Amino acid sequence: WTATSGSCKGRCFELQEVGPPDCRCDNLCKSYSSCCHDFDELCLKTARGWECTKDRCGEVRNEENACHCSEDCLSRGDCCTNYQVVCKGESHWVDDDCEEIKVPECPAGFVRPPLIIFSVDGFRASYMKKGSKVMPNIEKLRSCGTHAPYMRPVYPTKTFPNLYTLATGLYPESHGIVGNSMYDPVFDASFHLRGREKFNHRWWGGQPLWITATKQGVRAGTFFWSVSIPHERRILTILQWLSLPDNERPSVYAFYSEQPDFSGHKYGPFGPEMTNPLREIDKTVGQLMDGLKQLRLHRCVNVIFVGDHGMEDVTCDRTEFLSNYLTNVDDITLVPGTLGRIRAKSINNSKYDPKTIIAALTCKKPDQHFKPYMKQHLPKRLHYANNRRIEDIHLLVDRRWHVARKPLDVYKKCFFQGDHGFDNKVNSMQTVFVGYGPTFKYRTKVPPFENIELYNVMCDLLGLKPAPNNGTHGSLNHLLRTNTFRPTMPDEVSRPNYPGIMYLQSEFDLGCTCDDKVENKLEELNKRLHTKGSTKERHLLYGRPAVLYRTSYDILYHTDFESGYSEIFLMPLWTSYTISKQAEVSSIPEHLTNCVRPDVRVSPGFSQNCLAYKNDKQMSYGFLFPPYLSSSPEAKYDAFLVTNMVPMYPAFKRVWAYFQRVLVKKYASERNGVNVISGPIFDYNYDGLRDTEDEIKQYVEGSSIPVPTHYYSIITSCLDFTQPADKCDGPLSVSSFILPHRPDNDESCNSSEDESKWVEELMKMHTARVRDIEHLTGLDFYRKTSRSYSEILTLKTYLHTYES
Ligand SMILES: *[C@@H]1O[C@H](CO)[C@@H](O[C@@H]2O[C@H](CO)[C@@H](O[C@@H]3O[C@H](CO[C@H]4O[C@H](CO)[C@@H](O)[C@H](O[C@H]5O[C@H](CO)[C@@H](O)[C@H](O)[C@@H]5O[C@H]5O[C@H](CO)[C@@H](O)[C@H](O)[C@@H]5O)[C@@H]4O)[C@@H](O)[C@H](O[C@H]4O[C@H](CO)[C@@H](O)[C@H](O)[C@@H]4O)[C@@H]3O)[C@H](O)[C@H]2NC(C)=O)[C@H](O)[C@H]1NC(C)=O
Ligand SMILES: N#Cc1ccc(/C=C/C(=O)N2CC[C@@H]3CN(C(=O)c4ccc5[nH]nnc5c4)C[C@@H]3CC2)cc1
Ligand SMILES: [Ca+2]
Ligand SMILES: [Ca+2]
Numbered sequence: 006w007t008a009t010s011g012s013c014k015g016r017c018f019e020l021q022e023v024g025p026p027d028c029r030c031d032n033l034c035k036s037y038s039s040c041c042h043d044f045d046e047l048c049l050k051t052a053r054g055w056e057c058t059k060d061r062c063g064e065v066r067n068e069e070n071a072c073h074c075s076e077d078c079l080s081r082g083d084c085c086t087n088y089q090v091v092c093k094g095e096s097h098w099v100d101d102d103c104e105e106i107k108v109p110e111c112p113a114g115f116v117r118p119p120l121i122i123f124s125v126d127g128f129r130a131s132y133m134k135k136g137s138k139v140m141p142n143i144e145k146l147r148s149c150g151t152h153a154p155y156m157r158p159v160y161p162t163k164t165f166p167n168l169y170t171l172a173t174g175l176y177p178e179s180h181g182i183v184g185n186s187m188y189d190p191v192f193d194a195s196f197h198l199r200g201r202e203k204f205n206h207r208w209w210g211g212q213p214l215w216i217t218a219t220k221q222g223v224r225a226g227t228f229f230w231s232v233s234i235p236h237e238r239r240i241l242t243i244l245q246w247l248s249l250p251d252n253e254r255p256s257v258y259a260f261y262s263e264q265p266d267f268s269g270h271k272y273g274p275f276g277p278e279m280t281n282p283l284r285e286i287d288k289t290v291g292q293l294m295d296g297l298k299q300l301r302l303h304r305c306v307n308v309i310f311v312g313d314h315g316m317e318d319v320t321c322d323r324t325e326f327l328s329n330y331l332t333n334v335d336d337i338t339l340v341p342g343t344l345g346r347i348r349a350k351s352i353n354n355s356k357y358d359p360k361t362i363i364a365a366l367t368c369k370k371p372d373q374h375f376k377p378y379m380k381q382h383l384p385k386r387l388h389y390a391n392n393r394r395i396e397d398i399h400l401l402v403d404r405r406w407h408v409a410r411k412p413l414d415v416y417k418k419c420f421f422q423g424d425h426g427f428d429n430k431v432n433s434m435q436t437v438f439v440g441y442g443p444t445f446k447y448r449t450k451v452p453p454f455e456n457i458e459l460y461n462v463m464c465d466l467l468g469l470k471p472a473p474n475n476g477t478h479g480s481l482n483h484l485l486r487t488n489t490f491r492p493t494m495p496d497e498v499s500r501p502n503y504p505g506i507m508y509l510q511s512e513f514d515l516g517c518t519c520d521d522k523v524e525n526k527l528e529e530l531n532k533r534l535h536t537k538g539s540t541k542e543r544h545l546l547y548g549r550p551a552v553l554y555r556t557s558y559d560i561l562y563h564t565d566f567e568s569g570y571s572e573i574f575l576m577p578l579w580t581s582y583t584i585s586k587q588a589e590v591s592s593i594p595e596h597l598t599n600c601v602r603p604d605v606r607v608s609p610g611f612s613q614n615c616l617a618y619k620n621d622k623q624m625s626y627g628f629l630f631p632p633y634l635s636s637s638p639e640a641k642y643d644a645f646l647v648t649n650m651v652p653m654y655p656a657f658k659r660v661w662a663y664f665q666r667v668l669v670k671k672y673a674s675e676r677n678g679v680n681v682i683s684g685p686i687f688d689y690n691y692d693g694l695r696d697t698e699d700e701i702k703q704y705v706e707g708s709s710i711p712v713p714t715h716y717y718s719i720i721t722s723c724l725d726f727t728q729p730a731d732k733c734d735g736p737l738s739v740s741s742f743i744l745p746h747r748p749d750n751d752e753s754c755n756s757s758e759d760e761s762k763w764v765e766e767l768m769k770m771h772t773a774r775v776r777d778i779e780h781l782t783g784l785d786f787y788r789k790t791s792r793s794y795s796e797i798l799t800l801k802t803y804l805h806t807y808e809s
């Protein structure tokens with residue numbers, strides 16, 4: 006119940022929120038069905054439209070008007086935004102030349118430049134160019150401010166997960182809002198667009214910008230708006246708030262537009278009906294920019310123009326149905342659409358086997374427009390697993406398609422031409438970012454970045470300290486004229502050992518044979534020089550990675566490669582090597598096929614053994630530095646050391662062998678030499694972070710040799726590819742992957758064919774940021790370069806997407 010006979014007189018769009026059962030007058034009172042009777046009367050005036058006309062100038066104030074053209078209106082702070090244009094012969098903001106903003110130009114009492122977030126729902130990245138002729142305001146912002154060609158949203162590319170990601174800098178798995186529709190098993194509750202449930206605070210984790218603001222004494226305007234409040238009333242409300250006395254005036258605001266998402270759903274991303282909503286958005290920006298100019302704030306306020314996601318062509322006839330794959334189609338609940346999530350209909354059912362479901366859905370049709378995964382096997386770049394609201398079974402859907410359960414679910418539950426929510430690397434899902442203001446840069450293009458990064462910057466723009474988040478603070482410093490945040494490298498926690506020759510062959514009982522008894526003054530000091538690390542500046546191009554946790558490990562040098570070897574995990578954490586363009590591929594000679602040599606630098610007790618690999622028939626082994634790329638037949642023996650060896654399922658060796666034998670060389674050719682760092686990853690609990698020694702869920706049978714869940718590689722070269730990787734003078738170029746260590750290749754429906762038809766396709770799907778690998782390994786890369794740390798942070802957040 007709400008006693009709704011209180012009044013809104015003098016309380017229109019209040020900032021503090023009065024709790025039930027007193028009535029409300031704030032921008033969300035409508036969504037709670039708890040506005041005071043007079044709210045519509047007092048706070049939602051509409052009379053006379055939104056624009057001053059020639060006759061309205063210096064009128065006599067009429068409180069019934071939606072906005073005012075009267076002489077006192079500048080003082081009351083409630084003129085129509087075009088009041089100055091018509092009545093005082095002023096120019097629209099958009100018609101004024103782009104002049105640089107070297108210093109904030111703020112009116113007295115303004116302690117800091119305010120921030121306005123202008124959020125546009127469904128604003129697909131390609132609109133900035135494709136619709137530019139009809140969006141002059143937005144185009145002034147873009148070309149005068151700082152902009153990226155596009156901004157990458159989070160997965161799923163849905164509204165709620167993305168709008169709350171923006172506000173927190175957190176992944177959906179972390180903030181809790183993993184979809185527009187969710188079931189929480191511990192709540193036995195369901196979060197949906199229609200219903201009251203979504204209003205409970207228990208769904209919304211993390212700390213959103215406005216809470217972060219308040220707690221640090223920066224006052225915030227309320228971010229969310231009720232749909233029924235027209236957009237023009239939203240802008241004047243932000244302008245009225247900006248006229249408030251210094252002590253009550255918030256420093257951060259948000260505006261939201263349902264367009265163009267609303268139309269895009271009806272008419273597709275580029276339907277001819279799309280021109281108008283874009284025209285309308287632009288108008289609303291114009292209005293805001295005019296309102297700011299009236300207030301002398303247009304050279305004081307930082308404005309962020311940002312979208313939550315893009316829009317793809319989707320229609321009813323492009324739906325795949327589960328009922329065409331499953332028999333037990335009524336045992337399962339499917340959360341449907343542009344992404345699928347599956348669970349049991351009742352947990353009072355022990356005969357629910359996810360494996361059968363996964364199997365029944367795998368490569369079953371040659372045309373198939375989705376692919377099933379257990380959530381932990383989803384690409385690691387999506388970070389879509391560590392939450393109980395994310396169902397074990399996930400369906401990743403082809404762009405342009407839908408997944409539904411039964412055909413009835415579509416005809417009785419076509420009406421739409423557009424949708425979104427696909428994999429966040431898909432082009433049609435990309436969205437926009439423009440920043441304009443005194444703190445942003447002038448006429449500056451920046452490379453594309455991820456929406457998870459903006460919270461840090463917004464906190465910077467406001468002189469706030471960000472709550473712990475998934476952005477990488479400093480990686481967007483290149484957007485800003487002036488910086489609140491100087492980032493610093495984390496300190497190394499573990500210093501390495503540098504073992505020399507300490508053990509004799511016969512001290513080893515590993516069950517590892519090699520034909521190595523093939524056999525100077527000149528060339529016997531030289532290979533010793535290599536073991537002391539004389540070719541280190543060649544294979545370790547950016548300094549050794551730092552270990553950011555306490556552990557026990559040794560740096561091992563060789564002619565061709567260098568490793569940080571973990572005495573705990575009994576394999577290297579990292580293995581670094583440069584392959585120049587002219588380097589040549591060779592084969593494993595017939596006599597060395599099964600060669601594995603003991604490492605005299607490392608104790609038997611801290612080494613693996615071939616015996617275990619013999620006894621485990623699920624588990625074979627592979628090597629981190631590839632024998633195929635040895636510089637010389639002598640050097641090749643280095644690659645067969647027990648300390649270069651890592652466990653690998655036969656199925657995975659196929660992917661790995663192809664990567665090492667063919668692709669490394671190909672990359673070195675195209676990119677003019679590459680530096681490769683490769684290693685194991687252990688993330689059994691799929692939280693995206695390194696598991697500790699006591700969290701290992703799987704060992705090679707009858708041993709203490711832990712089995713990795715993933716294998717990564719970081720491949721780096723010179724951005725200017727006229728220079729060799731090992732002699733780059735400036736900016737670097739990187740690409741990375743985190744391959745899932747899986748006992749089969751069921752993910753690749755073409756796997757029965759030659760590795761040249763599927764393997765690179767798997768690796769592209771599993772691309773990664775260096776920073777994703779950092780979270781997973783507890784390492785810190787690029788410690789020694791000639792580049793600024795900011796630039797290196799940017800490099801570390803880069804993701805190579807393989808889109809056109
Ligand atoms: C991305 O960035 C985020 C934020 O920095 C990182 O997430 C953080 O990771 C650490 C380690 O996993 C977490 O620390 C643990 O914290 C708990 C207590 O946490 C409570 O307080 C904090 C602080 O205000 C809240 O943020 C927490 O909120 C979580 O739970 C609520 C429900 O209560 C939910 O509404 C939120 O969405 C959020 O849930 C998400 O995180 C939790 C993990 O806490 C996870 O279960 C869930 O699936 C969601 O994803 C919470 O109220 C503390 O008890 C722990 O200590 C224990 O472990 C240590 C191990 O050393 C033991 O020594 C000790 O004895 C304890 O047993 C941890 O310290 C931190 O909470 C978490 N923060 C957030 C906001 O998620 C991610 O790791 C980053 N991801 C990547 C890939 O980089
Ligand atoms: N940072 C930040 C920040 C800034 C502003 C804001 C502002 C938030 C805000 O007012 N809204 C966003 C959240 C939802 C969106 N919505 C929908 O009905 C809806 C829209 C598009 C869809 N496509 N497919 N299903 C869809 C469903 C109603 C609701 C109110 C409006 C939120 C966060
Ligand atoms: Ca949206
Ligand atoms: Ca983990």
Ligand SMILES: [Cl-]
Pocket residue numbers: 656659749750756
């Ligand atoms: Cl296979």
Ligand SMILES: [Zn+2]
Pocket residue numbers: 127164266267270425
């Ligand atoms: Zn939408």
